[PDB]
Amino acid sequence: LALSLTADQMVSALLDAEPPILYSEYFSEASMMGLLTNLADRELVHMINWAKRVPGFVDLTLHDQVHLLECAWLEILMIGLVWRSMEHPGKLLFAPNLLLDRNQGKCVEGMVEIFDMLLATSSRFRMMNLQGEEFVCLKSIILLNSGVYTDHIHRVLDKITDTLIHLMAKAGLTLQQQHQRLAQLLLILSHIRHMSNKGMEHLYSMKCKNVPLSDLLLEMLDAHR
């Protein structure tokens, strides 16, 4: 069904599948990670249904759906965060009622490094003038690509590529400008991967050195251990 869709039909479905921007509870080490854990836990529930609303993802086996989500869940939260924080330079918009800067990252050990990487990614999206239609394509790619190596998925990945190009085919971009911008967007995904892994190891650092994580988050975390 995904393959039989149009580029515009692809964008429209993805735009409609978007999870909502959740709010947080209304800092220190425990105070910081406490609010982030709670926020992320509620976001995951929306992400799961978002993933089921992604074309081609439903066709996958339940196991394969599970494996893909377990692999990219932090990447998807992070690229979300990055995109929300786009029009707030130097600040991270985790939630509309929770805007954080680098100085607040020093409340938790080793989080200032991951903060700057996120701020840099957000900055690069803004400088590239990333569109919302492109963003929903990228997160869809992260979902399907990040854990396919560890066939039908590649047929869908190629469709999102065509969709991304179609978006750049509009707005009057040269063919040269199309595959360059395409390359630039996909190279960012490599960095989102890095931030996720470094984020993941910090979460496991927090799990052993006992804020309490949710059962759902604890199970997404053990898939990387």
Partner: peptide, 9 residues
């Protein structure tokens, strides 16, 4: 896995 249940809502 909780994810199992949540993936078949």
């Amino acid at each position: 896995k909780i994810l199992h249940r949540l993936l078949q809502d």
